[PDB]
Design a protein around this ligand. Structure first.
Ligand SMILES: CC(C)CCN1c2nc(Nc3cc(F)c(O)c(F)c3)ncc2N(C)C(=O)[C@@H]1C
Length: 315
């Protein structure tokens, strides 16, 4: 349906030539892509194409149009004095056709390998890497939250290294993202069972379990379960993933028994001291409360050591 050599036209008039299909990402097929004007030998762009009616690409497109502006991001980076922000570049979008049916596509920045492929036994990472990933994610979280959105699906499969830079990590899918504060108006707290248990069950927030519209605290919470999983190689609810209520109950039990619940869970020699503190910080937020990003980062980097290379020596 999208053979190598297919020419796609974006809304800005630019043309893109499809290369090899490198996989599926989110609710899309991912292809290497080249501009028709001065292409490099090695692709620096991808085309994300929908393969189904409706889908979350429209929602993801709107997220990029609203918060992922090159200009705005660079200005943010300048003001916050960051080396980089783990959000891929958006290049354009449009429609492509196959057998009289239209499909939405987006042209995105080509990234490197996803974190699931370079993990140690049962999807683990070195303690130092785990903490740096959290910090990078918090920076991304701070930016999108300031721009009225919450992610709702942070997991190793959604984290990829930079194409040219292996010491940079990117959160690469925003299909489940949500506008929690449209025009500066935070959503009210309201539970809804019929809209409950969304997201990746292993990592989804308790708010998600209860059918509550996602807010900033849910994002921080997910990041916390993520880090515990990356450092320990399992979660107390690993054998209960097919029962969402059992997972919710186990998450409530973990948070209610903090910090000893997390402090005992860790494997010997690699403490969950920072992560327990992080979770304590994360679980103390009110529903509409802005997270203390700076305080969370200091919990993950208590000695203020500069962020260096990402160590993936257990792969
Ligand atoms: C969708 C993710 C979770 C997985 C997609 N993904 C890659 N995506 C990109 N760029 C990309 C793709 C997207 F959909 C984006 O929205 C985006 F902002 C950037 N480069 C390289 C890869 N590589 C090598 C992979 O292994 C897989 C296929």
């Amino acid at each position: 349906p999208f053979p190598e050599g297919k020419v796609l036209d974006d809304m800005e008039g630019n043309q893109w030539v499809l290369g090899k299909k490198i996989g599926s990402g989110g609710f899309g097929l991912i292809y290497l892509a080249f501009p028709t004007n001065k292409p490099e030998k090695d692709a620096r762009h991808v085309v994300k194409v929908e393969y189904q009616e409706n889908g979350p690409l429209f929602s993801e497109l709107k997220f990029y149009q609203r918060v992922a502006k090159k200009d705005c991001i660079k200005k943010w980076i300048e003001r916050k004095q960051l080396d980089y922000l783990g959000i891929p570049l958006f290049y354009g979008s449009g429609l492509t056709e196959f057998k009289g049916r239209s499909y939405r596509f987006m042209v995105m920045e080509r990234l490197g390998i996803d974190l699931q492929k370079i993990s140690g036994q049962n999807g683990t990472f070195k303690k130092s890497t785990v903490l740096q990933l959290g910090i990078r994610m918090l920076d991304v979280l701070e930016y999108i939250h300031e721009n009225e959105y919450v992610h709702g699906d942070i997991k190793a499969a959604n984290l990829l290294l930079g194409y040219k830079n292996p010491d940079q990590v990117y959160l690469a899918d925003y299909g489940l993202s949500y506008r929690y504060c449209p025009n500066g108006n935070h959503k009210q707290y309201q539970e809804n069972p019929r809209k409950g248990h969304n997201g990746t069950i292993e990592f989804t927030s308790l708010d998600a379990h209860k059918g509550v519209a996602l807010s900033r605290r849910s994002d921080v919470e997910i990041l916390g379960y993520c880090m515990l999983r990356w450092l320990c190689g399992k979660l107390p609810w690993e054998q209960n993933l097919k029962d969402p209520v059992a997972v919710q109950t186990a998450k409530t039990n973990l948070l209610d028994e903090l910090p000893q619940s997390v402090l005992k869970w860790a494997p010997s020699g690699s403490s969950c001291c920072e992560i327990a503190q992080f979770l304590v910080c994360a679980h103390s937020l009110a529903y509409d409360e802005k997270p203390n990003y700076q305080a969370l980062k200091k919990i993950l980097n208590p000695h203020g050591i500069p962020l260096g290379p990402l160590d993936f020596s257990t792969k």
